């Protein structure tokens, strides 16, 4: 019964094609609730879940100003990191930032986090104690020295284990009719011949929330991690998720295979056999 609030930021330089594209999204658990897109018309932080719409004009103004300020910081940092990594001005580069906090079912703070990336690789991260940084390389250590001297971790910590928790608690109350619900996977198996002598068995998990789930194939007790096709968990688009796992088996031996399903919403793990 734990919950999370996370903000994701992406800035992408567009040399000669205008200012960097900037996209910010906020989630509670796996539910998006705010967005900002620099290429969108409104130029405002915008609601994306029904329970955030009740926030007042002061909230939307403040969130819009703060997210625009993040965009302006990233704009500067794109130039700075180009210098640190000795790159030219002609290429497109990417900064990604994620931060947020987890609370338990009783609302207590569990952990906070912040991680930054450059061109899709680790750049700098706040450590779990919220007091020290880990830089990924000698360039990122320049930033670390600057943030250590500016006592950035103390300011960030006050948000991650304080303000972040305050707002997450508020959102969980404001959105209780939806955020507290957990939808169990509906499971079935399908069978698809691929020749006269082999068939694909596919194990399906549908309509589940949250997205975390485990699907496993076993053959006569033993596992088949090397002979299993497993797709990425995917959104249905209605707020639930879907996944499947598949295995090619000899015709007439279907009974030797079992799919195993694990979801937080399942009282017991499900086992399916053809």
């Amino acid at each position: 019964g734990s919950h999370s609030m996370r903000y994701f930021f992406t800035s992408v330089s567009r040399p000669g094609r205008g200012e960097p594209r900037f996209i910010a999204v906020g989630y509670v658990d796996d539910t998006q609730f705010v967005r900002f897109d620099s290429d969108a018309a409104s130029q405002r932080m915008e609601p994306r879940a029904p329970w955030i719409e009740q926030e007042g004009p002061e909230y939307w103004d403040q969130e819009t100003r703060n997210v625009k300020a993040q965009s302006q910081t990233d704009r500067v940092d794109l130039g700075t990191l180009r210098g640190y990594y000795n790159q030219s001005e002609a290429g497109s580069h990417t900064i990604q930032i994620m931060y947020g906090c987890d609370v338990g079912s009783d609302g207590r703070f569990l952990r906070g986090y912040r991680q930054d990336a450059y061109d899709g690789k680790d750049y700098i991260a706040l450590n779990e104690d919220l007091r020290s940084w880990t830089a990924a390389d000698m360039a990122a250590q320049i930033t670390k020295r600057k943030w250590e001297a500016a006592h950035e971790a103390e300011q960030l910590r006050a948000y991650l284990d304080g303000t972040c928790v305050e707002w997450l608690r508020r959102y969980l109350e404001n959105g209780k009719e939806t955020l507290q619900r957990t939808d169990p996977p509906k499971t079935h198996m399908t069978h698809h011949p691929i020749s006269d002598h082999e068939a694909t068995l596919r194990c399906w998990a549908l309509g589940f929330y949250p997205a975390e789930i485990t699907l496993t194939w076993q053959r006569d007790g033993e596992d088949q991690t090397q002979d299993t096709e497993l797709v990425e968990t995917r959104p249905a688009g209605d707020g639930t998720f879907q996944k499947w796992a598949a295995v090619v088996v000899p015709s007439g031996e279907e009974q030797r295979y079992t799919c195993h399903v694990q979801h937080e919403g399942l009282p017991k793990p499900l086992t399916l056999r053809w």
Binding site: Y7, Y59, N66, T143, Y159, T163
Partner: peptide, 9 residues
């Protein structure tokens, strides 16, 4: 609500 604080890199 997200964080209102920014030191550049």
């Amino acid at each position: 609500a997200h964080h209102g604080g920014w030191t550049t890199k």
